[PDB]
Design a protein around this nucleic acid. Structure first.
Lengths: 313, 314, 314, 313
DNA sequence: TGCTCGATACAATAGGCC
DNA sequence: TATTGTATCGAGCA
DNA sequence: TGCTCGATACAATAGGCC
DNA sequence: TATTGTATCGAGCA
């Protein structure tokens, strides 16, 4: 019941820490904010413009807001990170590509529209930390920024309150009427996403399933990274997906299937749950086939950020 | 440099967790309180009635208030701790006696008179966690108890606000005029506690130091546990300290030495700093000699909780 | 190449922090005069006393089961956890206090039953007056002579197998042999190696035990033979008796029927700390068969076979 | 008390080790050689061709032979030791100038006519790679060299066996008739060395002693380094001692005393014991006054290495 | 239908590295 | 991290 | 000088983490 | 990466 919320919060604030001042700053933001109708995520993997994998310290999905602790390079529990400058809206802390290759299956999202606030814990680093008065000031301004964000969304009636029990349940989206990219939709299994579009399934094996009420649309469950069978990628923008095969012959023979098959795909990408290391499937949008190269394989572009959902037949 | 405060706070809330719900409860208490005139300590070692060594998750020394998270029983392997029942005002979590004699060097205080507030994190135990609203309520009432204790202290004019810069500097205690147990006075070395009483000392490596302004008292820096040369103990309430030695012969030769004088000793116990593991010296009181013997041998009873200080002597 | 492993080994063995005053001289002299590096040796070897305290010997030849200990009565050592005491003749005169014995539980601690101990008395008489180098060199020489006679006693029986660093921790050595014995003093770097002696292809193994692929009645087991948070396990000083219990009695009641009808034989490799460099290693204790379950005291595994047969990968 | 032997031997072989292979090589040499009629010293401080202070790992005084192990730059237990190249028979391991400034008082000798043998741990001239057995071969060769040296001296009857009990006793020296550098003589105190020349002293506190049996000689107990009162030096060959004062007034007022004073001095320098660091007095030689000036001070040249002794009068 | 087996999901953790 | 056992659901076969 | 030990510096190893 | 174990420095004292 509510205990699920309790456990979830505890676990998010109980991760092994990457930065020295992370735990303090995030815990103070959460506790002072004191709004648990707001879902948050800690150590959220994101993808930068340059395709390197990064992360942010605290992430509110509903508001599209990130919060990042700036310690500079010196003090890091993980020497597995690196400190660089990037686009204004992108984090300063990155993962080395060597271990970003083992982080493929992890849940990695797109920050394009999102805002990032920084907390500066060092006055004239290296060395001396800033006084707590300043840090508390930054944290307070951030907190009220968050609050005004939430109020802006409720005023636009685009804000859906967070419920643990209903969020992984297909019926809630069937009732809602749409699965939206902005509602941050992730479902526990393939059978569930199938059951949003009119299937009734005990469970589902396949890597794709035909959409019942649209013949030109295919429900797709790809790994958006490279695996043994397929080499797939998705741009930081979220707009461009490429689909190729580790064997070129399979690609060449997939050309015909792609051009003559369903031209639209509803994509649910397989991602590891950030807690509990488990299979999950996140809604990436409605994509339309564009062209099939032999070299670059298949290229799908995203026409829609929301799809209509249906009751079973 | 107000950065010392920041470092201190970060490191107190940055300890490796003993309990699963510890970080949450403590961090929320601190932030929602957010009064930093209040000094606090996490994972404070305490000494129960029995000789067993226990610990509390959050501790305010100025108010004599502890906060313990109760989960009881699962303690997140793999901890050296154990879940037991004890005196009403004492913690539920203790350490195995085997691991207790390992931790002797640690700074272990007396909880006599201190209040302990608990936070119950499980509705149906074992297993299921409770709802956040309830936990938050428990924490809120604890915060109110803290604030009202702070108020009953400030209005009685017994409250001394916390300062990092001045608390380890002897000059401030010379200016204050006294050193008390309520003040919770711990100094970083022997030379400082010596310089409190009128010494100019640059370094002091000896165990005892002759009191400049009083010839019946001795400044003492004992280890209150067993070590290489001699065996010392202190009662859980901090009333009585027993002095002995490994060799019975040197106890015999030191027996007459004890019997003639000096008959009083002001005590600072050598204790490891709760942060950064270096030696420090904590005022235990002003103690008086009651007895000579074998075995338990010398016995020092505590007759005073406060000692006056003195300017350097030239 | 890789003949530098022997160098590093010898340097590090003769290079430990000294436990005694005269240890280094005696041991170094013995090694250098012996000049046989086909004989593996160990310094400061931890041994299991019948009194159950931990003791140590200054020099240990495993292949010969022969120890050498230097006798300097009492005092002459400053500030170590060691203690002088009397025991059985074939047991050392130096031990660890029970308090620090339980802190050393994880270390490699061996049964000395059957092993002979030679002593070197370095003082003519008490007070620390040293004995002239003449009779000391005499003692060392007769010791070395006895050592060579022992090695000769083994080589004519074709029991003796020369020492090789590169092949001693390699499973394939013992698969070719094809037996693992106590006489060969076998210890492996990891569980997966142990499993790959008996017919497994494992790349890595994190599990507490694995079924014997070619024997349905036998289980490969990697116990901690001391107490930890999950289990309470003991092994007799002669290694003939191993007791297994669980800290919790609910875990305990669940394991009784599992044991009584489960596989009745266990090939045991105990988890021990490396004597140099402190990494986990696994020492073959024997093949034990289940003799009992009495539920306050847990399972009793008695030692039947001192040798086990290996197998090429399946 | 033949125990003093064993205590000396274990205390020499039991010093805090400077080098990684030092213990093994030295111990193997000593135990395999097995000749305790030969006095030896470990970590013996020496003075190089330059003013710099070096050390050798093993030293046989009687034979004038040193033994040094070469492990090179790294594997240093002491970070203040340096690795360089120097004169033909000179050690390769030195001490930093400032860290040798606290080492002034140590017993530092002249290596001029001394042979130094190196154990090459890693590799040797002509370039061959080595470990273990090759090291052993080197050690064995060295042992042989030592023996042939001893025999060479014992056939010329220049060899004198080591006895720990009498060697610090003035009586043996007043008995054999001569104190010389060949015997490596250092006593425990000033009263002893004075009693060697015929004084009866129970206790002697003074910087110099007028010789009973010669009016032209002066027994002297200098610190051959710089201290608060004096600036004194001695050349690496041991042939030249310079004496100056901290104050110039004292120097000028000592100039007349030098030119008109007794013009030859018997020098016993004040050096710390290599074991226990007690003050002891080593015989440098019989030096004759040569020259003086303000600018660099007084200059003494060594005329003779053998002084006659005398019975108390 | 009832059995055998294989792919997938998932929990558990020694080993090695920081 | 990387590896393997255990539990589960479905495909395949008799 | 010569001795004694707390404080300090730095290597050795215990612990956290993937 | 954080804590513990070992060696060195140096003020105070006889």
């Amino acid at each position: 019941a509510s205990s699920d919320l309790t456990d979830y919060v505890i676990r998010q604030l109980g991760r092994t820490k990457n930065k020295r001042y992370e735990a303090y700053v995030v815990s103070r933001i959460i506790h002072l904010l004191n709004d648990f109708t707001l879902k948050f995520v800690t150590q959220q993997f994101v993808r930068l413009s340059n395709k390197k994998i990064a992360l942010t310290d605290l992430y509110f999905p509903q508001l599209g807001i990130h919060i990042e602790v700036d310690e500079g390079h010196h003090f890091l529990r993980n020497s597995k990170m690196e400190y660089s400058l990037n686009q204004i809206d992108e984090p300063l802390y990155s993962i080395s590509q060597t271990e970003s290759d083992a982080m493929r299956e992890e849940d990695i999202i797109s920050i394009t529209g999102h805002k990032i606030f920084r907390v500066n814990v060092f006055k004239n680093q290296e060395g001396q930390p800033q006084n707590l008065e300043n840090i508390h000031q930054q944290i307070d301004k951030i907190i009220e920024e968050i609050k005004t964000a939430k109020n802006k969304l409720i005023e636009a009636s685009t804000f859906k309150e967070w419920n643990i029990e209903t969020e992984y349940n297909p019926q809630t989206y069937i009732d809602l009427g749409r699965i939206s990219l902005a509602d941050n939709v992730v479902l526990k299994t393939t059978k569930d996403v199938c059951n949003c579009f009119g299937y009734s399934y005990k469970n589902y094996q396949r890597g794709g399933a035909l959409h019942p009420y649209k013949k030109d649309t295919l429900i797709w469950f790809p790994r958006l990274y490279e695996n043994k069978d397929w080499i797939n990628t998705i741009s930081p923008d979220g707009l461009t997906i490429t689909e190729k095969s580790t064997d070129e012959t399979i690609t060449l023979k997939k050309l015909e299937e792609w051009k003559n098959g369903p031209q639209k795909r509803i994509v649910f990408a397989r991602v590891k749950d950030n807690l509990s290391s488990r299979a999950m499937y996140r809604f990436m949008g409605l994509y339309e086939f564009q062209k099939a190269d032999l070299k670059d394989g298949a290229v799908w572009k995203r026409v829609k950020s929301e799809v209509q959902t249906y009751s079973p037949k």
